[model samples]
Target: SMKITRVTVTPIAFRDPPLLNASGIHEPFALRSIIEIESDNGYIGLGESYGDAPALAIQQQVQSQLIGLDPFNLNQLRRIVQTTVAAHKPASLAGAELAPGSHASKAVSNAYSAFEVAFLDLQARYLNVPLVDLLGGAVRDEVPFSAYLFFKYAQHVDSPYKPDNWGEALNEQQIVAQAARMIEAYGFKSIKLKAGTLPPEHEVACIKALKKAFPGYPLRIDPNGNWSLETSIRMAELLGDDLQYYEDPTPGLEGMAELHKRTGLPLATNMVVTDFDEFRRSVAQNSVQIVLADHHYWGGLRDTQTLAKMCDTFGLGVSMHSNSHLGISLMAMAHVAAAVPNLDYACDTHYPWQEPDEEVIKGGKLPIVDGCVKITRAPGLGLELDHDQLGKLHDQYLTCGIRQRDDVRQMQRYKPDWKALKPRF
Candidate 1:
């Protein structure tokens, strides 16, 4: 027996700080839609997901039929989604081709994640347990986060965007300075620098600089699978032991495996192979050493755990993948990260890059004591949305007029000649 009354989804926008990756500088404002599934009782469960038109539209469509259903009917939730959103293919949230975890554009596939998380949050709350507890409980009490380094301009090209205080880190010294500030604030145990924005030589200097500043600390570089296989081999050799592992060093199963073989460095990917079918083929070819799981496209919280266990069975390591998201997504990441049995490394996060947006889970942002966020004992996703903040951000989203993320197009504005191709190297 279940009594779920209403479901409401709201799209919210917050200024995205200047951060660079292989794609381009992030947009002026990142978009995320919030879900509040209200029950007859006090628990109004929450979820956050990609806020593109297709997704928000899907959330709205699903909400229309959701009023009469049971919140605890996890089976009913899946079935309703199956008939509603699963039949239609959605467009890419970013111009980045199906990007890492989103290799398929199937009906309600990744679009389904937003709804699934909300329902899970609702069910977890009804059980009076943390989201992690509902997902088989925590294997670890806290989740470790890595210092995500970027090569960004001092401010936005539009000039309205002010810097995040870690300004204009284009060179090795500036990058090192950014890392120093993060370590000082968060006590991060690991550092992950986004490569491919600069030349191989310049990127090498940044890694070397980081290793010099925080020696013995684990370091990783994700070029988002843009470099050539030979270039990845050289990157591995140049960084040598100073590097912890290689991530998306090159694209394709053959290229990744060859890069791994050539460099003898552990290869990792959020790209190249993300979905189960992709991993199936890639793992068979001995392509990837570690697979990064993102609930956004890997499906949902349960899908990621399934991925972790699958990776564990195959002797492949599992890690959490991230995108430009707000507090709700971060909490979701924390819950799943805590439950992941084989998550042996610190998770990648763009959370620190935000200029302190008014998160739904107000009070303070996530508890990052020494670069680790403790999983709280609170019920559901362990978060409560500040309705006032949600409304404000939703108004911001409505006025912004920005629809979907287009990194390549954004970069073209900065460097008119810039265009992204699979083998950008």
Candidate 2:
């Protein structure tokens, strides 16, 4: 029994571009929590998650209760996590919570996720087995990922943050160029565009451009349910076979169901069907054809596997969703994705958007060779933390002073009256 001796939660900030989304523009620095759990037996397990102020605060609350707990005692861990988080009303990790209600599943789940991954990592290291083995055996040697593209300004407007290599991509030509470079570097076979920042007309044209540039590649567009039902149908008609699936073009299961009935296109969501209750209603409405699972929001790896089975049982497709994250979370994603038997689509990642020098892993960043992460036989999550790098990013966090991500506020810095509007078309 590997018992936890100490828990360390380091909030880190990394350089992020002014990527536009349904919300607004991205902040210069993206925050994430790097979790380290040291066992009495000398093994240190790792986990990563949202580093917003509320998330960090809740993590701290959960952190203090973890001493002397066995890494394998997940039932006890859940009890402790739920009880601790139940006292506090959790602030949303994405500047707001994804799931509705005052109930603490989203809060408790987000709090429990980091610790659970670390616990499993510690448990695997104690047994000298890969984390994937603990979930289930590897169903695939490598897990495929999609190239996630965004509409963006070339740099953070008038901010002190350094510019990223990917220059401005506000138009179709620039967007295609961005996709080409990403595919050339990572050999990604699938592509997903973060739409709803621009008008639906312009976004549809950009998707057409992407199709012309990369023939035979499956494409997806997620507007994050920011469009109206009428706009969703119009874009779906315009896209036709160009899109592999439409992701939350409009909000709610009722709206998505109506849109699907009108257009008859396969749909997907990370927005409406975030939890089991939402999933049940979504299935009943036949709202989405694909469900994107994120371990951080869905609790942890085991719950994600449970989600995959549930999706499989319903004959629905499953993939992963991503945020601005680092190596530890990426490796965790790889292990879980490797274990899932019916992962219907390549997962999404923001790995390419992060600068390699800022990674907190020992050997720089984990490689995404040919659009996939190869699962190795190494014990645990198969990664070693870079103390110096972690310290450096933590310092960035302190100086950056961004305890939460507010894309709308960041965009307001450039356009004084800019509001995050839906159905802008």
Candidate 3:
């Protein structure tokens, strides 16, 4: 049996770049933390989680709790992490830590996901199987790609600049010009536009322009929970055949159901189905036509796998929400997309955020080829973390470390010492 031997977490920040739009969120210049898991057999696996500003504190928590545990025993490890998370409920970590609500919770979720993924990689490597093989045999080797366009704050037609400025900010004309250019340059078959963040008229105009430019290209709109059921229905009708889908048009399940029932276009939601129970309910109710699963939000691979199976069983298409991590995370996502049978749409992973310093692994960038990107055939998750480049990136950000016990023999005989293992916060 491979014994858990080492665990380390590091956070890195990216250099400041321009804001994509008025979303108010900036490109995370630094990694929240990257988790490394090694076995006694000399095999190593890498995973990453978000490490907001006060990342060091979270690192300390992991260091004190995660070392020496069996990296293959993901279920047990997740349980322990959940315990720590709950015991330290309401705890704060990131700079101006906000009690693990939005950003902090997202970071924590990413960290846990990173740990789980690393363990899965370690297990797959030990068995000499590709991660997809372990995920149940591939149903389709190729997965399609989708481009996400941030046009809520895009300038109007009368504005001087382009609409969708790859990375640099652009005015209205520039945004539209850029979108046209993206179609010409990337040849994307499907594009997702940001909705709900702008006025209904602005969204209508943007969709019309995009459709007019590329009449055949499929267009999806994600309001990101920025709309009411009535308004979303109106927009969906106004966009008509030009709109292919509406993601998270409203907010909760009720709103989603209302919009899904009202709109002629397909509706999808991510970040809304936070767990398996919610996913099951969504499937049962036929709440949405597409399932956009985020590994971090739904725990880890196991959760994602369950969701994928549900999507297939219900005839729903599967796409993953983009995390914008390095190659490892993207590679893992590619494996997932490849394994799902009914995966119809291109994934939402085509982010114009921070590009990787190197491409040791494939399928992390935009234009994921032929609508589907290729997954690596290598063992495990089929990617490596560039420690040298990571070192350079981390130099600009804060850092932290974490370790946990990994002795399977002891773990098998172990019982929860609730009092002793309680978080100190």
> What is the lDDT, from 0 to 100, of the residue 313 in candidate 3?
78
Evaluated with lDDT, which candidate comes out highest? 2
lDDT against true structure, model 3: 0.61
Candidates in order: C-alpha RMSD to true structure = 2.1, 2.0, 10.9
**For every model shown, what is its TM-score relative to the native structure?**
0.94, 0.96, 0.79
Ranking by lDDT: 2, 1, 3
After superposition, candidate 3 runs with Cα above 4 Å error:
15-23, 27-31, 53-60, 92-111, 152-173, 180-187, 280-286, 356-367, 399-425
Q: Over the stretch 1-425, how does candidate 3's per-residue lDDT look in tens digits?
A: 56777777766655323232212222324244666778788887777655543334544476557667777677677677666666656754332211121344554554467688888888788888888887787777766667666642222223322343354323345456656655555455788775544466676777787777777788787766766677777777787777677777676787777777766567777746656677778776778877788776566777788888877878877766764455666667777777777666777754444454433233434335555566656788766667776676676554222121111212222224312110111
Q: What is the per-residue lDDT of model 1 for residues 135-230, given as tens digits with 9 covering 90 to 100?
A: 888999978999998888888876755555667888888889889998888888999998877888789889988877898889988888878877
State in Å the error of residue 232, model 3: 1.4
Candidate 2: clashing residue pairs, number: 0
Q: What are the Cα lDDT values of the candidates?
A: 0.79, 0.87, 0.61
Model 2, CA-based lDDT? 0.87
Error of 3 at 173 (Å): 4.6
Q: Using TM-score as the measure, which candidate wins?
A: 2
